[PDB]
């Protein structure tokens, strides 16, 4: 038998349903989602980190001339100068007044320290959802990890359950993501091979151990000071460190709907948005005939306490009279009130106390109890606390 | 080195089995066939037998098998097997045989002793799979090369293993014999036996090479004597009773696992093409049944697939977008029309 | 798949029960009223009340490495190409991504190949690979296999060591005086699909897109156009007076 149901997208709350049959007893269903993940499909483009200015020892020739040989190191700058009078701690490295030539060559390489201290770029698309559910059908408790696409149901005890696609494909992530130190920021990083000096992306390395990088740091060599040996060089500071000083706040504290982002695998938790359609195919074995369930007679309901707070704050006692003693499920067809428990123990002439949540000042509604309808009416009062530490439990009707 | 490969099957013995059809009828045989596998392309098939090969009572080509508990050996070139035509035995190793012979419907395996012929036939399908798209019955002398799957010729430790089990109790009516008034039990030298009887009350006795007689029993048919062995495991055969307790003491590798190799595949004759305005005709003459696959190079292919085993005529239309076809195993041929 | 039969469990002249090993799609049954036989005559003495127990199961065959079928889901095809570009007699062969970014840089020249004008992909959402051939087939999803058709056995990987089987294995009454386990199940669906074997994508693809699978890919077929954007610096533009007129 096919049964369609709707699930609000919010973990931490229970949800009760009754499956009605004309000739058989109603069947209870209790569902509690424990954790929902919105995992994006992300690919890896490149990695960047601190760079280190490499240089070879200066090439000094005395009364002669030199030539530049290309090593093809990334962003290599090679230059030759003349008119130098070298010095050393022991004395004069030359006897020539002029014609001495110096060759200075410089380049960059990835800093050794950034095996872990590396910033990663990312491009994300086509987020998929994965929910962990606790199901109780026919008082059979099970915990399941289910896929919520248009296929891939789960089978247990013959019950088949399929959760349809999301009602909304919204994703907190933008196209272009940046990952660093377990923090995820939406940033518009430039693409491969088009970096600029001073900004994020002066260095471009495909992988951590690619050993093939493209660098654009605007490195410029300078005339060495007379009377000493060195290679003066100048380049813009690290765009990585400049972006580190900028550091706009995190998606962890700026994303809407209160999503919780985690970075072991990139994922978003408990994004409270939308609803999940679910379809039950229940075998006829679990369905119970009417004669096997107690039937009430002359039952009345009275409200003992009223607080229409966020939590369950309406307590009602039902005085009934039953031929048989057996557990059965109570249900509220309307959205006026939400019952807490899924079933209540039933004895031969006892009274059943039930807890529920409502937002109406003057509640009045009918309880389906296992064979019959019973009216229950009353007026109710506000709470005493202006703020609470848990979300809403019942819908707000017009 | 191969003795380290042979070492696994030094720990086991052959076993008698039931076979539904000896030369006489329903029968107990040493050459009962458990299973047959035929997945290789060139007709290479694997038989799982109840005997052992390559081990003497280490020798190259021999068959080691069982006779009422007594192990015997025969040269390998005496046994034969067939389905529709005489097959050819290549090599044997342990409980497995590799055979190469054409299609059929049943597998018969037989051999001849000095005066008694042993055989039986099992009806398990054997299938011959052609490679490519040229159906044949015997691989050609010449052609081209392709990659199909054939069964490897040599044994090596692969990732496929089987399970042995502790042998059960084997009843032997030969051991029991009638004395003047009692029943005489004579277990074989160096082996233990279990005698269980109900001639009087319940009886159970483990004899260890002891010729013991039991009172209160007059006839011999009332009760049974068994044989006990601890070493020399047996395969998990469905034709034997099991021992007592957990039935597991390791596993053995299975040789002759399939592999990839180079395959000879026939070549069809060249079809003679004749061209006309936006059309082509293929004068065609096949040696064996062969596949035509034809496609158009447009948004929709109108793909046509056809098996022809006789000379025929086909007229095809070609447009500027293009026509493509494969006959046999030739590289695909693409034709592109022109204005004229 | 390979049917694995346990050794027939005999307790003649007594009684037995079932011990589930929890192997995939295992079936355990108990039969009474058996008079088994062995080469050395009858096994035991009691005429009736003899209990056989037969346990049968299925395990992946030993030939699963070089003879197996894989099911894949395909979406968001990506295009790239190998170009040989000669501008200002500067000829280079280079790989380029024809997406809307990632220019190729040489001699100061930056070439951007924009996205494809058509999103046509020669693969359906589901595909099946087997022995270097690809077929667009609607295979049933994992866990919903049907006997006698594709997907009777479902293993997460070649060595997952855990499979879900739906082969409809049913035991039968053993023949009198014979130690054996008579079983019945539908033929494997993989060989039936092999018998069917509709023509492959490399012979039925539109636009003639040649399909090779070192990785699953398609090549050499004409659909649409590549927009090209040239970013040329001002240095390579030569004076006319320096050129023949």
């Amino acid at each position, epitope marked *: 038998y096919e049964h369609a149901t709707t699930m609000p997208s919010q973990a931490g709350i229970s949800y009760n349903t009754i499956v009605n049959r004309a000739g058989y007893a109603p069947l209870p269903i209790s569902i509690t989602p424990t954790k929902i993940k919105l995992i994006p*499909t992300v690919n890896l483009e490149y990695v960047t980190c601190h760079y280190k200015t490499g240089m070879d020892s200066p090439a000094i020739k005395c009364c002669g001339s030199q030539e530049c040989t290309p090593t093809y190191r990334p962003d290599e700058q090679c230059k030759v100068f003349t008119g130098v009078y070298p010095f050393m701690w022991g004395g004069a490295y030359c006897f020539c007044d002029t014609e001495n030539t110096q060759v200075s060559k410089a380049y960059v390489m990835k800093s050794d320290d950034c095996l872990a201290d590396h910033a990663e770029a990312y491009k994300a698309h086509t987020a998929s959802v994965q929910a962990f559910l606790n199901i109780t059908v026919g008082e059979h408790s099970i915990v399941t990890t289910v896929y919520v696409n248009g296929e891939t149901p789960v089978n247990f005890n013959g019950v088949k359950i399929t959760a349809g696609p999301l009602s909304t494909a919204w994703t907190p992530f933008d196209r272009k993501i940046v990952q660093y130190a377990g923090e995820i920021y939406n940033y518009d990083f430039p693409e491969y091979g088009a970096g600029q000096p001073g900004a994020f992306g002066d260095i471009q390395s495909r992988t951590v151990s690619s050993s093939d990088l493209y660098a654009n740091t605007n490195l410029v060599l300078q005339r060495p000071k007379a009377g000493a040996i060195h290679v003066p060089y100048t380049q813009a500071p690290s765009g990585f460190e400049q972006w580190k000083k900028d550091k706009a706040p995190s998606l962890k504290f700026t994303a809407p709907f209160g999503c919780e982002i985690y970075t072991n*695998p990139i994922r978003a938790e408990n994004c409270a948005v939308g609803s999940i359609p679910l379809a039950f195919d229940i075998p006829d074995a679990l369905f119970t005939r009417v004669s096997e369930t107690p039937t009430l007679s002359a039952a009345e309901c009275t409200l003992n306490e009223c607080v229409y707070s966020s939590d369950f704050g309406g307590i009602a006692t039902v005085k009934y009279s039953a031929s048989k003693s057996g557990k059965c499920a109570v249900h509220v067809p309307s959205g006026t009130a939400t019952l807490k428990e899924a079933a209540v123990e039933l004895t031969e002439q006892g009274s059943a106390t039930i807890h529920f949540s409502t937002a109406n000042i003057h509640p009045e509604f009918r309880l389906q109890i296992c064979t019959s309808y019973v009216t229950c009416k009353g007026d109710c009062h506000p709470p005493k606390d202006h703020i609470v530490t848990h979300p809403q439990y019942h819908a707000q009707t017009f | 080195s191969t003795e380290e490969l042979f070492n696994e099957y030094k720990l086991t013995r052959p076993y008698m089995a039931r076979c539904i059809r000896c030369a006489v009828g329903s029968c107990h045989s040493p050459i009962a066939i458990e299973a047959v596998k035929s997945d290789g392309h060139d007709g290479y098939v694997r038989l799982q037998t109840s005997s052992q090969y390559g081990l003497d009572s280490l020798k190259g080509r021999t068959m080691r098998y069982d006779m009422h508990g007594t192990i015997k050996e025969i040269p390998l070139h005496q046994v034969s097997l067939y389905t529709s035509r005489p097959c050819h035995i290549v090599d044997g190793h342990g409980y497995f045989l590799l055979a190469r012979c054409p299609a059929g419907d049943s597998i018969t395996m037989e051999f001849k002793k000095d005066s008694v012929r042993h055989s039986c036939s099992v009806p398990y399908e054997v299938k011959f799979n052609p490679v490519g798209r040229e159906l044949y019955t015997h691989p050609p002398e010449h052609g081209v090369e392709q990659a199909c799957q054939v069964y490897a010729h*040599d044994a090596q430790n*692969r990732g496929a293993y089987v399970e042995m089990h502790l042998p059960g109790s084997e009843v032997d009516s030969s051991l029991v014999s009638l004395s003047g008034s009692s029943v005489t039990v004579t277990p074989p030298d160096g082996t233990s036996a279990l005698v269980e009887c109900e001639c009087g009350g319940t009886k159970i006795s483990e004899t260890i090479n002891k010729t013991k007689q039991f009172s209160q029993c007059t006839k011999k048919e009332q009760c049974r004597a068994y044989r006990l062995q601890n070493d020399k495991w047996v395969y998990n055969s469905d034709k034997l009773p099991k021992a007592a307790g957990a039935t597991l003491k390791g596993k053995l590798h299975v040789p002759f696992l399939l592999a990839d190799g180079k395959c000879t595949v026939p070549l069809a004759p060249e079809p003679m093409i004749t061209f006309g305005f936006r059309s082509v005709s293929l004068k065609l003459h096949p040696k064996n049944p062969t596949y035509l696959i034809t496609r158009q190079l447009a948004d929709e292919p109108h793909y046509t697939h056809e098996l022809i085993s006789e000379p025929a005529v086909r007229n095809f239309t070609v447009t500027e977008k293009g026509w493509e076809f494969v006959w046999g195993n030739h590289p695909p041929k693409r034709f592109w029309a022109q204005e004229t | 798949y390979k049917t694995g039969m346990d050794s027939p469990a005999i307790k003649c002249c007594g009684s037995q029960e079932c011990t589930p090993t929890y192997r995939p799609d295992e079936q355990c049954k108990v039969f009474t009223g058996v008079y088994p036989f062995m080469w050395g005559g009858a096994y035991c003495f009691c005429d009736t009340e003899n209990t056989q127990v037969s346990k049968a199961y299925v395990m992946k065959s030993d030939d699963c490495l070089a003879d197996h079928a894989e099911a894949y889901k395909a979406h968001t095809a990506s295009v790239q190409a190998f170009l040989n570009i000669t501008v200002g007699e500067h000829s280079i062969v280079t790989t380029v991504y024809v997406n809307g970014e990632t220019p190729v840089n040489f001699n100061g020249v930056k070439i951007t190949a924009g996205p494809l004008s058509t999103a046509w992909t020669p693969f359906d959402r589901k595909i099946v690979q087997y022995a270097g051939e690809i077929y667009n087939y609607d295979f049933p999803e994992y866990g919903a296999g049907q006997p006698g058709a594709f997907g009777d056995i479902q293993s997460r990987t070649v060595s997952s060591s855990d499979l879900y089987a739906n082969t409809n294995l049913v035991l039968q009454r053993p023949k009198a005086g014979a130690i054996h386990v008579p079983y019945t199940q539908a033929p494997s669906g993989f060989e039936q699909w092999k018998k069917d074997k509709a023509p492959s994508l490399k012979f039925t693809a539109p636009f003639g897109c040649e399909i090779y699978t070192n*990785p699953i890919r398609a090549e050499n077929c004409a659909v649409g156009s590549i927009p090209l954007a040239f970013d040329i610096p001002d240095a390579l533009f030569t004076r006319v007076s320096e050129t023949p007129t």
Partner: nanobody
Amino acid sequence: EVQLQASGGGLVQAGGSLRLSCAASGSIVSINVMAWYRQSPGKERELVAKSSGPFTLYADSVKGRFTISNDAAKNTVDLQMNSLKPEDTAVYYCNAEGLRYPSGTYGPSAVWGQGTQVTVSS
């Protein structure tokens, strides 16, 4: 993006014993097909070894002289070479097929490493 890095090989005399190691790194959890391929100068690519879980395969000309071992925990494949012949001069590549990304953005199916050159001197 998963990549394969090859190591080992080098120069050796006839009859020597070497090792080749290929390692996979990236967003991968479980791997199915480990394979090795050799390409001599002037000839097309060919398979030499093929490992997948417990099973191992070998070609016709290479039986009894090469051994392949796979470590799924490290996602590495090691090829032990013994008693090499002058026909073995070629460049060896390591292949990975049937990659299972741990969601794990679905991506390219197969990947290829740079490979290593092996040369034996007569």
